[PDB]
């Protein structure tokens, strides 16, 4: 749409100041995709996830490679 | 063509008219200029000190380094906590470079970057004009939750961004007077624990000579007639008026002035949508308004007078 | 002319080949310290954006909607426009249907 | 807006140094022969009284030009475009002439 | 009417039968947060003094 | 003075949401259809538009 | 109390929040009768004002509370590789709503 | 030395008293001269003014 608008997948415009800010607005994520890193109060997965710092030592697989039930970071 | 590895460059001294002491004094500190050109508030400022970057010049976030007042001079290393920044009241600061920094601040008539609660314990003061600026046709203290989304140029947080660059030479000599030494009727240099010094002497003849101990200079009385200064000091220096020029000023190095000019998307207030009046020939317009808001009307023909 | 819009020119940004004709006066230092006393005119370029009145888009008759890098005036109405159309054969139908 | 940029000051005590001209925006070169300049260390070196110090002051666009600045643009003649919806039975015609 | 000395009237302070007139434009939430954008006229009361 | 307080809004996610009349002094009521509130914790309803 | 100003700020400082709101409000010097002062006089006329009473006990009307309604934290959901899980903190019962489907 | 104001205030900042003093007195910037200035240049006409 306009310059001042990020257009998505979805025919819908959005505004510049939502993109990259920590929300997916739009139905496909595409406002979120790319971007910059994001430095993780959040535990960090071994292969670079962000996950609440609740998920950590839940006894359920959250990270994809499964760091957050690992032995070595959560001792019993 | 453009460095940024601050190894090879240095701080240095400046002269500011308005010092702590209220007189214009030599510091480690002192602002060369001022850029205010920010629509959200934020100003750019040049200071004769560098951020972010300890004594070896390793960038190091949160230390600062600085030239030091004693005459066998070094450049020393403090915490950037010391570094407050103020034009009316406190400014919030926004970033850190070598030499420059990004601070936000109130209006006012001056301002002063200042080195709080440590052993230097300077501040420096210049004359700068800050004024509330705002974007677009209504007057705002703070912008609103929800307005038009209007584009605006605000100065960049990242340090990463360069809005031009500063031209870097090889200083100088300095010539310190504690390099002297007048005793009787004969006069004597003292160079610093084993750094070498060069003396240029001019007696009764112009004699110069690299020397590392105390000696003798020919037979004249006054200390005021030759100096000596420490030489081997590659490291490039701002073309600052309060220096005095190499033999050779060719442009040595360039590096980025940060926070670059911006545009971006920024709300604006929405003013009350006023009441309109009919009447045969005309109408009139209600126009309540809290802040200045600008109202702009012409007419569709020939003669558009424009109000 | 110093003090006036116009006190820096050059062809682009960029450009190496600037001219400038503000009132620079260097001053005899009187000081111990090193200093360059120099004296200068006021910025014309900040004096024209005090002083700029009202743009085009405020001022243009017939309501011309100024916009600008392609600069033009967009949906405007000041006259009338000669149209001559060719109106295809197929689209006339005869008079008996 | 310029920078008025002020060089680092060039002395040579018991000397003198005139200066050649240059091609910056507004260089203006000045020569000074009584000083006897001063930084934090003292006086600069060794002359007592004939010395000489070169001024100079030449002018730089400000670092944020590429934003606020202004061009000066000489316009001439103008063209007008007209986007056209033109129907004629039941069909329908956008054209730009 | 709005704006003007009188915006708001009742019979007693205390009365729960109160009439206003003050011009109230909702207008509509184009942000992110929750948000109730409303523009108003001025106080009658604080303009009359 | 007037004090022009603003209720909390209420919000309906894939539904109808029209508001009847009240008495109180200048009651303004204004019904919006493509809303998508974000409290502290994220989106507030699952209803896409 | 406070001086003149053109906005209000109340801040949390040197914590774990460290948090301030600031609200427009023109807050003007305020003074009694047919004379301006920065300060009240030692002596005076002793004329009648009125200013809020310091002790809390006194009150100047009411504010309504109401029962609070949904928060609906974005932490209580997971996204895997093609569903979605819903997990309260601790032992917590969390009311989930989901109309994808049905 | 003081910038410009419309009361002078003298307090005892911690300790046992705790206490300040506040008089009205219009506190103005003055400048020496014939020109205005916040503050004294590096390099001016060295006039003659009273402090
Ligand atoms: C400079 O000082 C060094 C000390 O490392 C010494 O070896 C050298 O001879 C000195 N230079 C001259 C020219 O004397
Ligand atoms: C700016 O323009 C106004 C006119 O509205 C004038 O009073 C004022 O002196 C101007 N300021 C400067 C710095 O020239
Ligand atoms: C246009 O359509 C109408 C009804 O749709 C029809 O009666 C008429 O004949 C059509 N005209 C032409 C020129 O095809
Ligand atoms: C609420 O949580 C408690 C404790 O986990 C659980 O026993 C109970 O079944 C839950 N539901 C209700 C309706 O109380
Ligand atoms: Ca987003
Ligand atoms: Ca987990």
Request: net charge neutral; hydrophobic share 30%.
């Amino acid at each position: 749409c306009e310059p001042s608008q990020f257009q998505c997948t979805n025919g819908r415009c959005i505004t510049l100041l939502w993109k990259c800010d920590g929300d997916e607005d739009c139905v496909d994520g595409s406002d979120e995709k790319n971007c910059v890193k994001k430095t993780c109060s959040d535990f960090v997965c071994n292969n670079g996830q962000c996950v609440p710092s609740r998920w950590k030592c839940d006894g359920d697989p959250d990270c994809e490679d499964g760091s957050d039930e690992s032995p070595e970071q959560c001792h019993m | 063509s453009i460095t940024d590895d601050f190894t090879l460059t240095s701080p240095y001294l400046g002269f500011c008219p308005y010092c702590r002491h209220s007189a214009p004094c030599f510091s480690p500190i002192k602002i060369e200029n001022v850029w205010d050109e920010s629509d959200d508030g934020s100003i750019r400022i040049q200071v004769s000190a560098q951020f972010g970057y300890n004594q070896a010049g390793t960038a190091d976030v949160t230390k600062f380094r600085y030239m030091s007042y004693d005459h066998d001079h070094d450049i020393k290393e403090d915490s950037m906590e010391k570094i407050a920044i103020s034009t009316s009241g406190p400014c919030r600061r926004l970033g850190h470079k070598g030499y420059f920094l990004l601070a936000q601040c109130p209006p006012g008539d001056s301002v002063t970057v200042s080195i709080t609660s440590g052993a230097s314990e300077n501040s420096c003061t210049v004359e700068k004009k800050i004024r509330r600026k705002f974007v677009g046709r209504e007057e705002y203290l703070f912008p609103p939750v929800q307005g038009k989304l209007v584009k605006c140029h605000v100065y960049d947080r990242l340090k990463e961004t360069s809005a031009g660059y500063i031209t870097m030479h090889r200083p100088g000599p300095h010539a310190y007077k504690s390099y002297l030494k007048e005793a009787s009727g004969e006069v004597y240099i003292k160079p610093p624990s084993g750094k070498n010094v060069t003396y240029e002497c001019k007696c009764g003849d112009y004699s110069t000579g690299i020397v590392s101990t105390q000696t003798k200079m020919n037979g004249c009385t006054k200390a005021r007639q030759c100096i000596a200064y420490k030489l081997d000091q590659t490291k490039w220096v701002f073309n600052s008026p309060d220096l005095i020029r190499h033999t050779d000023h060719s442009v040595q190095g360039k590096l980025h002035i940060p926070f670059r000019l911006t545009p971006t998307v920024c709300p604006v207030p929405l003013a009350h949508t006023p009441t309109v009046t009919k009447w045969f020939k005309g109408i009139t317009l209600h126009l309540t308004a809290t802040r200045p808001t600008l109202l702009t009307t012409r007419k569709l023909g020939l003669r558009a007078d424009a109000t | 002319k110093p003090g006036a819009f116009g006190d820096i020119q050059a062809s682009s940004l960029d450009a190496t080949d600037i001219v400038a004709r503000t009132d620079i006066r260097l001053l005899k230092p009187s000081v111990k310290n090193i200093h360059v006393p120099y004296t200068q005119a006021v910025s014309g370029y900040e004096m024209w954006k005090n002083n700029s009145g009202r743009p085009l888009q405020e001022t243009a008759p017939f309501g011309c909607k100024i916009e600008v890098e392609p600069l033009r005036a967009s949906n405007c109405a000041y006259g009338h426009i000669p149209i001559s159309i060719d109106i295809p054969d197929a689209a006339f139908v005869r008079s008996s249907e | 807006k310029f920078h008025t940029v002020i060089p680092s000051p060039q002395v040579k005590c018991c000397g003198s140094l005139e200066c050649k001209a240059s091609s910056k925006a507004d260089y203006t070169c000045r020569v000074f022969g009584g000083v006897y300049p001063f930084m934090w260390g003292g006086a600069q070196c060794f002359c007592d009284s004939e010395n000489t110090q070169l001024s100079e002051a030449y002018v730089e666009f400000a670092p944020d030009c590429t934003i606020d600045h202004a061009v000066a643009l000489k316009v001439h003649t103008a063209a007008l475009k007209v986007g056209l919806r033109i129907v004629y039975g039941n069909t329908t015609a956008h054209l730009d002439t």
